[PDB]
Design a protein around this nucleic acid. Sequence first.
RNA 1: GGUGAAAUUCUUGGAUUUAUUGAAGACUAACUACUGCGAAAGCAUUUGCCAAGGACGUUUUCAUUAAUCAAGAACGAAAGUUAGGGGAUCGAAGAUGAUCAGAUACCGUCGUAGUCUUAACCAUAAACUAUGCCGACUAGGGAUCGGGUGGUGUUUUUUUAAUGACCCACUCGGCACCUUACGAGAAAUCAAAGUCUUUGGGUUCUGGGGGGAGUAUGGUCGCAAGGCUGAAACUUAAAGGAAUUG
Lengths: 25, 197, 97, 214, 91, 97, 127
Amino acid sequence: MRAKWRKKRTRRLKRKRRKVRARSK
Amino acid sequence: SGRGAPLAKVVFRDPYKYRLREEIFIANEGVHTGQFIYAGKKASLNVGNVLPLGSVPEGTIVSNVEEKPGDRGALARASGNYVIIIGHNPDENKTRVRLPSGAKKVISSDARGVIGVIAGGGRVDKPLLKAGRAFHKYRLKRNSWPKTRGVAMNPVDHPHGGGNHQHIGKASTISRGAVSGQKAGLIAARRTGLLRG
Amino acid sequence: SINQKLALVIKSGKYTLGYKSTVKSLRQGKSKLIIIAANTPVLRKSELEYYAMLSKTKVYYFQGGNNELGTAVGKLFRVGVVSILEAGDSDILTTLA
Amino acid sequence: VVDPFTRKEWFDIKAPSTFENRNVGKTLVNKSTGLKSASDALKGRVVEVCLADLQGSEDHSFRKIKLRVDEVQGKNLLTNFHGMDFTTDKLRSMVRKWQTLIEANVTVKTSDDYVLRIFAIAFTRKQANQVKRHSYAQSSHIRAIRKVISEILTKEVQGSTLAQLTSKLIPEVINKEIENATKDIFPLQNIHVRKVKLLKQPKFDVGALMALHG
Amino acid sequence: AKRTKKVGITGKYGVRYGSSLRRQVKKLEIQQHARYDCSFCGKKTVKRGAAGIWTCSCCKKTVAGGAYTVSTAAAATVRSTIRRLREMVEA
Amino acid sequence: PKKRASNGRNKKGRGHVKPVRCVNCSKSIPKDKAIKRMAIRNIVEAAAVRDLSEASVYPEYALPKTYNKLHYCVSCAIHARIVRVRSREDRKNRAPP
Amino acid sequence: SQVFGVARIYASFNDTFVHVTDLSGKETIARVTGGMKVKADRDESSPYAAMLAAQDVAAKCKEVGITAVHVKIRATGGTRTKTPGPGGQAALRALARSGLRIGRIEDVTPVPSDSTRKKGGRRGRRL
RNA sequence: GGUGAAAUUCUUGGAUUUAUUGAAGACUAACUACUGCGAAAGCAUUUGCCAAGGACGUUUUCAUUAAUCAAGAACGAAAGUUAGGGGAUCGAAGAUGAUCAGAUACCGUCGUAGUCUUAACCAUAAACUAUGCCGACUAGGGAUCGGGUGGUGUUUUUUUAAUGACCCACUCGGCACCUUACGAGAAAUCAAAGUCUUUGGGUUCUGGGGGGAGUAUGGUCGCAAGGCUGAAACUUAAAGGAAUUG
Ligand SMILES: [Mg+2]
Ligand SMILES: [Mg+2]
Ligand SMILES: [Mg+2]
Ligand SMILES: [Mg+2]
Ligand SMILES: [Mg+2]
Ligand SMILES: [Mg+2]
Ligand SMILES: [Mg+2]
Ligand SMILES: [Mg+2]
Ligand SMILES: [Mg+2]
Ligand SMILES: [Mg+2]
Ligand SMILES: [Mg+2]
Ligand SMILES: [Mg+2]
Ligand SMILES: [Mg+2]
Ligand SMILES: [Mg+2]
Ligand SMILES: [Mg+2]
Ligand SMILES: [Mg+2]
Ligand SMILES: [Mg+2]
Ligand SMILES: [Mg+2]
Ligand SMILES: [Mg+2]
Ligand SMILES: [Mg+2]
Ligand SMILES: [Mg+2]
Ligand SMILES: [Mg+2]
Ligand SMILES: [Mg+2]
Ligand SMILES: [Mg+2]
Ligand SMILES: [Mg+2]
Ligand SMILES: [Mg+2]
Ligand SMILES: [Mg+2]
Ligand SMILES: [Mg+2]
Ligand SMILES: [Mg+2]
Ligand SMILES: [Mg+2]
Ligand SMILES: [Mg+2]
Ligand SMILES: [Mg+2]
Ligand SMILES: [Mg+2]
Ligand SMILES: [Mg+2]
Ligand SMILES: [Mg+2]
Ligand SMILES: [Mg+2]
Ligand SMILES: [Mg+2]
Ligand SMILES: [Mg+2]
Ligand SMILES: [Mg+2]
Ligand SMILES: [Mg+2]
Ligand SMILES: [Zn+2]
Ligand SMILES: [Zn+2]
């Protein structure tokens, strides 16, 4: 749970939420 | 017309008769109308000037340079291109030079070149944007445009022709020792696929 | 100083600028020293140089071009040549090399 | 498998007249066989020697000097000046901490047309009565100290021929003359012309060489 | 008013060819239509002819130069390198 | 808790210093933090000089020292003999030997 | 009355070099390196290997006529070590006690006014 | 060659090493420090031009013009983005030789982008003194950088001067340091982190248990990577700070 990487993951897996809410148009 | 670089019309008096012989050079970046140009072994080292290669120090940047002496210019004539001199061998005078393509090469130290860089550099940095822009490009060059892929023809017309899908079928890298009618594709290629260099 | 020996000249003295005024300044011998910009053509330069020998008027060549000399005399236009007529209370007439 | 040394021959080296001890040593070259001109394999070589050897005394035990082989008069190699440098120990021992280094260079051309770069070194020293431990210069003194040094270094070349420069270097004369110009600006201790490098040479003129043979 | 946010001169092209390509020629169309100062008469009156042909309005010197600007960075450097070399054969 | 008043090491009043490279490790380290030590030694170890004394021509020849300045990162410096962990109250001392 | 060559050792780690040449440097005479007197693949740097190297070196220096030698020891340098390998001392001593006349030694290891990046990454060679 | 030791690689077309040269691009060693400068980010080769700045000096000048600041602006390491140059070195990716139970890690050889640069973006770092700025006051001591003042003072010896260097003494201003607390603090420690329950000199920002979460949503900036602003359901009795003994 190194913050640097609990936070890389937090972004890796939040642009994914952004890029999948645009499929749903 | 049809040349990226511009040309310099340069006039000299005739040494052996009372007239003018005008010469048609390729313009090096920086020479201007009304400039004086100096041509020959003792001519000084400034852009515009033609000198034999053995008479220019190692590092000089030159264009329109001869392969054999007196051929009047073979290497490095297109816009923005030049050759660097890398060294000398005054025993049987030869001069090593690097060409635009990155090829090194040795040529007779009497081979003349013009100091500086061919004008018009950077031409190929602008997107053509439009078929027509390239229509008129080859309008003034030769009937080589446009190009239909062989894969879109019938097998009567091209090694790549035919088939119920558009596909090449055998490998597309062709032996160098192939024969006319068979050399379509990547002739004598030695690798292939996207580079790492 | 170096360059502002011209700031002296415009206040404490009289000057004229441009080519065909500094031949009228020179055929009449009443010009003590002229300054020539760097980019004024060579043919122009040797004409003002010949008027120098005939008027016993010595000459200075300038680091910048005609765009730079204009601002050097606080003018807002290009000036290829300038003629000094009186230093008056300046420092330039004597002190040069 | 052939012992390539038996095909090789010795040539003794004589230095310029400007040096006390002229005959130095010997070198080696393959013998002049068919189209092989060992003369050409000889000229162009260079060798560096401590000034202790050229002048016998050891107060120039630093200061190596290079020398290059020009025309050979048959089995003797007459050589000409090529360049001088401070051995790295002498150099690295002058750069003690807690004191300011000063350096300058200037590329000048000599009476005989020789263009060359010459390097000066100098370290500020403490004044005798000092109580603070460092004796640093002040960057305006350094600029001033730098300015005067380049003027004398330039004035001595072109106010001297190259051979004259050899004549005026072995005595370390210009160190004093630089010491006699910066005395009023800051103390300074290790004033030295640290290096001399030959950048270009004129047409041969073998006459100048044979002036250095006796 | 400000006529447009970013397209600038490439408004003529409208919506076609892709924005990045349009942005790529905007750069060079500004360069090539610019008025360059004259190295001879000091006037901002040099404008491109054909590619590589730069010529001043009044003083009418013509300079062979870049395809879209009057002096490519490469030729500026080359002028440096030759000077550095010339300044040495001069010594 | 803050272990040293020098924070890491000896930089007060600039903000950024510049990096050097450990001679053993190659690691980047700010110059003010590096552990510095001079290897001032002769080119001869214990003995081997009077085994070379009569081996030399040149009656009068001094002994040239071989100079080289060394920078250590913290980790290397600790792992060699260069510095050692010190007590709490012993860390405030700048006596070399 | 005595004659001269120049020594030129290279005290690297992983190896030490000993080869002498005309005071010119151009024409050289027998090179022998520390990895010719061992074949363990590792200890080519070792002092023992350097001794056997100088001893086999000086013998060839006698066979042609080198009375004496000036020496120029040299670490790797560049951006790499500046501190000379362990088989430098051993070769030099194994050269005096070998019977050549000497004097005028310099450390010629190359050092930059510095420049160009060092290998390792900024976290250093970590093991 | 490289390494703990190896191997990948190179080599009788002579490598490695030597000597003589040449090119290219980055860097600015040693000198380099409890030293300087800058609003901060940061700035170390020479010289030239260009504007700028603090401190000091001052029986010059205006006279309250000032402190701190929602809104709004400039600058902002490294990496990253777009285009041209440049591309020696190092080198995310990658490729490989090892090591390993595995080892697309550490170590070894390569190596793309990158590293430099111009023209545009980006706006963030343990961007740290983890200490807002202005003002006032309250201990002891020795150094140092700048500027000034003083002395039959040492050398400069140019004869003595006079400067520069130095010495001693003062002082204004700055980077810091030592001792100590009389005071502060949970303590580590602190000359401010003091002049506070004996609680008020002026002002700006931020925090209110731990998670969830800098997430969701709206807005906005960005080409993008992302930045700025920013919840709630829900869950939990501790997380946490400093020190003590083992
Ligand atoms: Mg097609
Ligand atoms: Mg069809
Ligand atoms: Mg067919
Ligand atoms: Mg086929
Ligand atoms: Mg087909
Ligand atoms: Mg298809
Ligand atoms: Mg297909
Ligand atoms: Mg008129
Ligand atoms: Mg801790
Ligand atoms: Mg400051
Ligand atoms: Mg910082
Ligand atoms: Mg050193
Ligand atoms: Mg090895
Ligand atoms: Mg470890
Ligand atoms: Mg070789
Ligand atoms: Mg460079
Ligand atoms: Mg300083
Ligand atoms: Mg430096
Ligand atoms: Mg705001
Ligand atoms: Mg940045
Ligand atoms: Mg950046
Ligand atoms: Mg690029
Ligand atoms: Mg690269
Ligand atoms: Mg590498
Ligand atoms: Mg990998
Ligand atoms: Mg690796
Ligand atoms: Mg980039
Ligand atoms: Mg912004
Ligand atoms: Mg922040
Ligand atoms: Mg903070
Ligand atoms: Mg506070
Ligand atoms: Mg205060
Ligand atoms: Mg106090
Ligand atoms: Mg003072
Ligand atoms: Mg005084
Ligand atoms: Mg006094
Ligand atoms: Mg909470
Ligand atoms: Mg949002
Ligand atoms: Mg519980
Ligand atoms: Mg704790
Ligand atoms: Zn014009
Ligand atoms: Zn380390």
